[PDB]
Design an enzyme around this catalytic site. Structure first.
Site, PDB file in Angstrom:
ATOM      1  N   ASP A  15      11.189  43.633  23.213  1.00  0.00           N
ATOM      2  CA  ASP A  15      10.816  43.589  21.696  1.00  0.00           C
ATOM      3  C   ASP A  15      10.636  42.444  20.870  1.00  0.00           C
ATOM      4  O   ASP A  15      10.811  42.437  19.513  1.00  0.00           O
ATOM      5  CB  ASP A  15      10.033  44.631  20.533  1.00  0.00           C
ATOM      6  N   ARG A  29      11.146  39.449  15.843  1.00  0.00           N
ATOM      7  CA  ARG A  29      10.582  40.831  16.798  1.00  0.00           C
ATOM      8  C   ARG A  29       9.536  40.971  16.279  1.00  0.00           C
ATOM      9  O   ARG A  29       8.321  40.210  15.219  1.00  0.00           O
ATOM     10  CB  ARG A  29      11.736  41.957  15.547  1.00  0.00           C
ATOM     11  N   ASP A  34       5.735  48.249  19.519  1.00  0.00           N
ATOM     12  CA  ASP A  34       7.191  49.308  20.022  1.00  0.00           C
ATOM     13  C   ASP A  34       8.003  49.171  21.040  1.00  0.00           C
ATOM     14  O   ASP A  34       7.069  50.159  22.229  1.00  0.00           O
ATOM     15  CB  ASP A  34       7.908  50.106  19.441  1.00  0.00           C
ATOM     16  N   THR A  35       8.660  48.649  21.709  1.00  0.00           N
ATOM     17  CA  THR A  35       9.795  48.564  23.636  1.00  0.00           C
ATOM     18  C   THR A  35      10.265  50.130  23.037  1.00  0.00           C
ATOM     19  O   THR A  35      10.948  50.210  22.380  1.00  0.00           O
ATOM     20  CB  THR A  35       9.843  47.482  24.045  1.00  0.00           C
ATOM     21  N   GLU A  37      13.928  51.579  23.458  1.00  0.00           N
ATOM     22  CA  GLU A  37      14.849  50.842  24.332  1.00  0.00           C
ATOM     23  C   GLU A  37      15.634  50.978  25.168  1.00  0.00           C
ATOM     24  O   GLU A  37      15.604  51.399  26.081  1.00  0.00           O
ATOM     25  CB  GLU A  37      16.223  51.525  22.844  1.00  0.00           C
ATOM     26  N   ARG A  75      15.402  39.182  10.759  1.00  0.00           N
ATOM     27  CA  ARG A  75      14.186  38.278  12.008  1.00  0.00           C
ATOM     28  C   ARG A  75      13.113  38.353  11.725  1.00  0.00           C
ATOM     29  O   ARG A  75      12.597  39.387  10.559  1.00  0.00           O
ATOM     30  CB  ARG A  75      14.767  40.221  13.488  1.00  0.00           C
TER      31      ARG A  75
HETATM   32  C1  LIG Z   1       8.038  45.573  13.593  1.00  0.00           C
HETATM   33  C2  LIG Z   1       9.094  45.695  12.324  1.00  0.00           C
HETATM   34  C3  LIG Z   1       9.941  46.668  12.345  1.00  0.00           C
HETATM   35  N1  LIG Z   1      10.691  46.825  11.016  1.00  0.00           N
HETATM   36  C4  LIG Z   1      11.926  47.401  10.378  1.00  0.00           C
HETATM   37  C5  LIG Z   1      11.150  48.499  10.293  1.00  0.00           C
HETATM   38  C6  LIG Z   1      12.842  49.831  11.557  1.00  0.00           C
HETATM   39  O1  LIG Z   1      13.303  49.662  10.475  1.00  0.00           O
HETATM   40  P1  LIG Z   1      14.873  51.099  10.368  1.00  0.00           P
HETATM   41  O2  LIG Z   1      16.150  49.835  11.211  1.00  0.00           O
HETATM   42  O3  LIG Z   1      15.164  50.986   9.014  1.00  0.00           O
HETATM   43  O4  LIG Z   1      14.136  51.901  11.909  1.00  0.00           O
HETATM   44  C7  LIG Z   1      13.113  48.568  12.253  1.00  0.00           C
HETATM   45  C8  LIG Z   1      12.557  48.537  13.575  1.00  0.00           C
HETATM   46  O5  LIG Z   1      12.783  47.914  14.416  1.00  0.00           O
HETATM   47  P2  LIG Z   1      13.642  47.828  16.145  1.00  0.00           P
HETATM   48  O6  LIG Z   1      12.957  48.888  17.181  1.00  0.00           O
HETATM   49  O7  LIG Z   1      14.180  46.956  16.476  1.00  0.00           O
HETATM   50  O8  LIG Z   1      14.826  48.955  16.020  1.00  0.00           O
HETATM   51  O9  LIG Z   1      12.479  47.261  11.906  1.00  0.00           O
HETATM   52  C9  LIG Z   1      10.299  46.142   9.951  1.00  0.00           C
HETATM   53  O10 LIG Z   1      11.322  46.012   9.249  1.00  0.00           O
HETATM   54  N2  LIG Z   1       9.412  45.196   9.841  1.00  0.00           N
HETATM   55  C10 LIG Z   1       8.751  45.322  10.652  1.00  0.00           C
HETATM   56  O11 LIG Z   1       7.202  44.517  11.469  1.00  0.00           O
HETATM   57 CA   LIG Z   2      12.454  48.946  19.827  1.00  0.00          CA
END
Ligand SMILES: Cc1cn([C@H]2C[C@H](OP(=O)(O)O)[C@@H](COP(=O)(O)O)O2)c(=O)[nH]c1=O
Ligand SMILES: [Ca+2]
Length: 129
Positions: A15, A29, A34-35, A37, A75
């Site tokens: 993702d 991103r 959510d994919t 890891e 991102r």
């Molecule tokens: C998809 C997305 C993720 N995120 C943030 C929240 C999550 O915070 P935390 O890192 O504090 O959990 C993280 C999850 O992405 P990943 O699944 O790539 O880790 O990225 C956003 O802030 N906005 C979004 O639209």
């Molecule tokens: Ca992920």
């Protein structure tokens, strides 16, 4: 919402993807998904699926939603299209991603994706199997 150009730099995992946008490298991103890891189950399959779809694509496009365009990590948040086909959608449709991280203001394709998850779940595909 509007499609804008970008070119692939590198597939990262299920993702996230590195794209050149407005001539600058940035990690994107995928909105609303959510994919797993890479270390987790279906993680490699997700990564492989994103990778294939973006690398085979003649044309990549970035579509920002109405809200935040960048996350807390720097991102870019977007819908990413490969030759007119949404990667975010395809991942869900195949059970390689869940619908997730649905924030108010950045949720235009919510229902479209939730329809795809229902179908993938119907079919007991991958994560739903
Ligand atoms: C998809 C997305 C993720 N995120 C943030 C929240 C999550 O915070 P935390 O890192 O504090 O959990 C993280 C999850 O992405 P990943 O699944 O790539 O880790 O990225 C956003 O802030 N906005 C979004 O639209
Ligand atoms: Ca992920």
């Amino acid at each position: 919402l509007h499609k804008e150009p970008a070119t692939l730099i590198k597939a990262i995992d299920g993702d996230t993807v590195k794209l050149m946008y407005k001539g600058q490298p940035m990690t994107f991103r995928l909105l609303l998904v959510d994919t797993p890891e890479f270390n987790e189950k279906y993680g490699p399959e997700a990564s492989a699926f994103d990778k294939k779809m973006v690398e085979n694509a003649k044309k990549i496009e970035v579509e920002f939603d109405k809200g935040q365009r960048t996350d807390k990590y720097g991102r870019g948040l977007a819908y990413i299209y490969a030759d007119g086909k949404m990667v975010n959608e395809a991942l869900v449709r195949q059970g390689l991603a869940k619908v997730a991280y649905v924030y108010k203001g950045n949720n235009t394709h919510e229902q479209l994706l939730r329809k795809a998850e229902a179908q993938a779940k119907k079919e007991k595909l991958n994560i739903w199997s």
